[PDB]
A paper describes a structure:
S100A4 (also known as mts1, metastasin, calvasculin, p9Ka) has been strongly associated with increased metastasis properties in several animal models. The interaction of S100A4 to different binding partners (for example p53, annexin A2, CD16, non-muscle myosin II) is mediated by Ca2+-induced conformational changes. It has been widely recognized that the conformational change upon Ca2+-binding opens up a hydrophobic cleft on the protein surface. Recently a series of X-ray and a NMR structure of S100A4 complexed with a NMIIA fragment revealed detailed information about the binding sequence and the molecular interactions between S100A4 and the NMIIA fragment.
Since the role of the C-terminal random coil is not well understood in the mechanism of Ca2+- binding we investigated wild-type and truncated S100A4 (Δ13 mutant truncated to residue 88) by solution small-angle X-ray scattering and NMR spectroscopy and rationalized the observed changes by molecular dynamics simulations. We also examined how the deletion of the C-terminal region affects Ca2+-binding by isothermal titration calorimetry and solved the crystal structure of Δ13 mutant in complex with the NMIIA interacting peptide. Therefore we solved the crystal structure of Ca2+-saturated Δ13 mutant in complex with MPT peptide, which apart from some differences observed, essentially confirmed the asymmetric binding mode of MPT observed in complexes of the full length protein and Δ8 C-terminal truncated mutant. Since the ITC measurements did not reveal the true affinity of MPT to S100A4, we also performed fluorescence polarization measurements. These showed that WT and Δ13 S100A4 have similar affinity to fluorescein labelled MPT with subnanomolar Kd of 0.12±0.06 nM (SEM) and 0.28±0.11 nM (SEM), respectively. The Δ13 mutant also disassembled filaments of NMIIA fragment 1712Q-1960E with similar efficiency as the wild-type protein. Importantly, the Ca2+-binding affinity of the high affinity site is forty times higher in the Δ13 mutant than the affinity determined for the wild-type S100A4. With this high affinity, the C-terminally truncated S100A4 would remain constitutively active inside of the cells and this alone would impair its Ca2+-dependent regulatory functions.
Residue numbers in the entry:
A (entry chain D): 1 to 84
B (entry chain R): 1902 to 1930
C (entry chain C): 2 to 47, 50 to 88
The structure:
């Protein structure tokens, strides 16, 4: 049977797709999809100010290959950075 | 895990962490 | 909490369950890493001492001969990335 940690990895994957598949490239997050994933799935990690300017800056910092998307690897870098 | 890719990913994570709380930019807490 | 928040919490708690047994309480040695993989990531295990030693080496980007929480998260990311492919 799947361990809690194995299920947690499954949720890492499924949560990404829940948002990446909305628009455009089904396997990458655009800015809107990223904002929605954070807002809806990571409320406890959000700051006092979730304005557009703060978000645009976050997008740029996550987009390490400069394609104007957040792919699964880039998303895992993000989760690894906030986890603890 | 290929060492080249773990090492690159660790640099990327360290970089992003440093920006978070040493420590610029704050959409995230 | 959201499922993702709960997932990150499990990632954190699972690390500390094993890292806190011996030595540095915030890093995994080969023994602690072996236990964690065996008990918590069975579906990903092929196993022998050489295999765990190689995995440890691969994960040890800071070259301190232990696996810290960041290195562990990078490892989990690589497993998830494999599962996502
Ligand atoms: Ca998309
Ligand atoms: Ca990108
Ligand atoms: Ca330890
Ligand atoms: Ca290390």
């Amino acid at each position: 049977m799947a361990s809690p940690l194995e299920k947690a990895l499954d949720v890492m994957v499924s949560t990404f797709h829940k948002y990446s598949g909305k628009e455009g490239d089904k396997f990458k997050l655009n800015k809107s999809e990223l904002k929605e994933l954070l807002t809806r799935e990571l409320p406890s990690f959000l700051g006092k100010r979730t304005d557009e300017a703060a978000f645009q800056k976050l997008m740029s910092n996550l987009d390490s290959n400069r394609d104007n998307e957040v792919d699964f690897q880039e998303y895992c870098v993000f989760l690894s950075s906030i986890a603890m | 895990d290929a060492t080249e890719t773990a090492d690159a990913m660790n640099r990327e994570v360290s970089s992003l962490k440093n920006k978070l709380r040493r420590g610029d930019l704050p959409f995230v807490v």
